[PDB]
């Protein structure tokens, strides 16, 4: 065992040496001549009300119009952001919902939480009333995220340190990903839906191959847990935020961190991030009731979406880049522009 | 234009339902039931269940008031993430194994809960559920509480001690010493935003529900008074 650990330390040192060899220059120097974005003075344009308790997650529709929200009073609600009219009010079996999803074709939405079970709902039923269509079991820890590859495959990640791929039609785990030593928190599919990433509660991020069911790369550098993650639009980069009160940007080919976003005034932890359509603005949420705007290529801040009366716990951007939502333990969704 | 009437009709029907729900939601109290493994927690939970998956929910009502108690299960021991979900519960029951070094683990856990920021507004109830076992351990003499607790050597029964009939002075001394360790934690830095309610319990105490009922009522009254800025 001692020899194994020694030569493993040798491998880790070799990896660190290899990564260090590829760091010719800093990201800032390359973008040292990019003009500042300027003051992004965004303001609320709508306000959606009806939730009793806090809000954990929401997902946009593929048309940039419909969106679904999940709260801990046991309710899923599909709004029409153009007119703020409710369309459905879906009760839940387990009131501790910790995530939600919106199917690409717009027919299904899935949610799950401490119950460990990811449920599938149908929005195009013949009767017209949404009803359960498939309940997926097989995890042994609270489920913390879920996204749709298509109408027939949902990828789920849980707190027992394992991410799994499901075949909705049968309910079996076609594949299971392992290699994490802590809770897995957030993930996001690639633009092509070939690869996805997930950072866990060990300050590490791992890139996975969906087809082969095995880890492809590993990234480190954070000091504490990881709460949010997301792919850059081109699919060749992804930025992560941690409880250490910092955000960072990686690249799947550089195999190393390229930039960090930090400020001394910030002593709280991030809870959700997301990019813009052009991938030029890195939004983010914080525990101190604010949401910041980070100019991705310059490391600076360029705007604050203040207005929330409690922690921000979710965020997103429409597929066409028109509107941005936010949710909070205050129980109120806001639409900015 | 017909669609707008069709949609506006839909919204009204939905809003009628949510307002119907809102009333039901406020009439239910939520209680998280922590507890060490060897604490007899399951015994007290079964006691509540008889008289009236990653989580288990038990519903019971007292005096027409509805309490909703959630007991964790099938989770890993790393509590620092799925514990945030319980910031809005009315209270966090907490069973402890007094007679058991288990007790030090309970002290550290209680401190960690007390000083956490998201939970810095959720009052915690406290139970001590091995009084008979502690009494027999100390009475038998082969326990030597002094070795693990040197401070217990110079401790004396507090002036306000009220012992049950037939209770030996040594038993009372030990029992009340156990509690003092936690109260040192629960008094400092309290800030008056949340309190602790110690009790001495037994596995088969019928009135375990009554204590939590009264303490929930007290928490509600304190919150309301603080709202009006009286206390």
């Amino acid at each position: 065992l001692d020899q194994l650990r020694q030569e493993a330390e040798q491998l880790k040192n070799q990896i660190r040496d290899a990564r260090k060899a590829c760091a010719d220059a800093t990201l800032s120097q390359i973008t040292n001549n990019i003009d500042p974005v300027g003051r992004i003075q965004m303001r609320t344009r709508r306000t959606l009300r009806g939730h009793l308790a806090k809000i954990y997650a929401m997902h946009w529709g593929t048309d940039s119009r419909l969106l679904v929200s999940a709260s801990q009073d046991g309710k899923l609600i599909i709004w029409d952001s153009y007119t703020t009219n409710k369309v459905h009010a879906i009760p839940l079996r387990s009131s501790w919902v910790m995530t939600c999803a919106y199917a690409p074709s717009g027919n299904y939405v899935a949610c799950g939480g401490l119950d460990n079970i990811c449920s599938i709902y149908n929005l195009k039923t013949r009767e017209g009333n949404v009803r359960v269509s498939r309940e997926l079991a097989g995890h042994t820890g609270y489920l913390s995220c879920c996204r749709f590859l298509d109408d027939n495959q949902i990828v789920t990640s849980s707190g027992d340190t394992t991410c799994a791929l499901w075949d909705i039609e049968t309910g079996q785990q076609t594949t299971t990903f392992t290699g994490h030593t802590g809770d897995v928190m957030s993930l996001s599919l690639a633009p092509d839906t070939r690869l996805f990433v997930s950072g866990a509660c060990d300050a590490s991020a791992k890139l996975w191959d969906v087809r082969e069911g095995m880890c492809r790369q590993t990234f480190t550098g954070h000091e504490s847990d990881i709460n949010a993650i997301c792919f850059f639009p081109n699919g060749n980069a992804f930025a992560t935020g941690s409880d250490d009160a910092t955000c960072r940007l990686f690249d799947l080919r550089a195999d190393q961190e390229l930039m960090t976003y930090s400020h001394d005034n910030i002593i709280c932890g991030i809870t959700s991030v997301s990019f813009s359509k052009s991938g030029r603005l890195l939004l983010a949420g914080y525990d101190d009731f604010n949401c910041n705007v980070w100019d991705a290529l310059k490391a600076d801040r360029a705007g604050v979406l203040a207005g929330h009366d409690n922690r921000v716990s979710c965020l997103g951007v429409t597929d066409d880049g028109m509107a941005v939502a936010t949710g909070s333990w205050d129980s109120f969704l806001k639409i900015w522009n | 234009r017909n669609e707008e009437k069709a949609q506006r009709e839909a919204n009204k029907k939905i809003e009628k339902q949510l307002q119907k729900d809102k009333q039901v939601y406020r009439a239910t109290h939520r209680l998280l039931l922590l507890g060490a493994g060897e604490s007899g927690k399951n015994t007290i939970v079964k006691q509540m269940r008889i008289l009236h998956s990653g989580i288990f929910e038990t519903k019971f009502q007292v005096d027409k008031v509805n309490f909703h108690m959630f007991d964790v299960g099938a989770q890993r021991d790393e509590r620092r993430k799925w514990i945030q979900c319980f910031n809005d519960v009315t209270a966090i029951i907490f069973v402890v194994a007094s007679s058991s070094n288990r007790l030090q683990a309970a002290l550290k856990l209680f401190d960690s809960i007390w000083n956490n920021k998201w939970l810095r507004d959720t009052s915690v109830i406290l139970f001590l559920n091995k009084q008979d076992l502690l009494a027999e351990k100390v009475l038998a003499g082969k326990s030597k509480i002094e070795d693990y607790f040197p401070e217990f050597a110079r401790y004396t029964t507090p002036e306000d001690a009220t012992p049950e009939p037939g209770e030996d002075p040594r038993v009372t001394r030990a029992k009340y010493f156990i509690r003092d360790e936690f109260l040192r934690i629960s008094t400092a830095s309290g800030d008056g935003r949340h309190y602790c309610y110690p009790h001495f319990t037994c596995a088969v105490d019928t009135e375990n529900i009554r204590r939590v009922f009264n303490d929930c009522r007290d928490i509600i009254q304190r919150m309301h008074l603080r709202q009006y800025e009286l206390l």
Partner: nanobody
Amino acid sequence: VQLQESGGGLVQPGGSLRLSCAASGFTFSNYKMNWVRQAPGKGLEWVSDISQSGASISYTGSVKGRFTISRDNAKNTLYLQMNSLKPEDTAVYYCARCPAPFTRDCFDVTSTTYAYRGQGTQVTV
């Protein structure tokens, strides 16, 4: 997060020995630290923790007055001084860290599979 213990060895009962824990990979001053040991056939047991700057201290009752805790934030180190060992204290010592910075709570440091926990050194009497 890298934790590197050192200073173990063999000592006759009643002797003395010092444990020197070295750390790197994060801002040392911000994190509350602990010493936690594992004896054979026993679950993890807690010993002593010290605050960010050394203001506060604590011990488990059994080791009261025997050991001592101390840290040097200037040198990225944690220390433990032992005196008058007893036969029933043979165990491995895990230099430990609390998860989140700038906080006072230290959830689940003694967990079975904590992430920010050192490999540890052996001290036998």
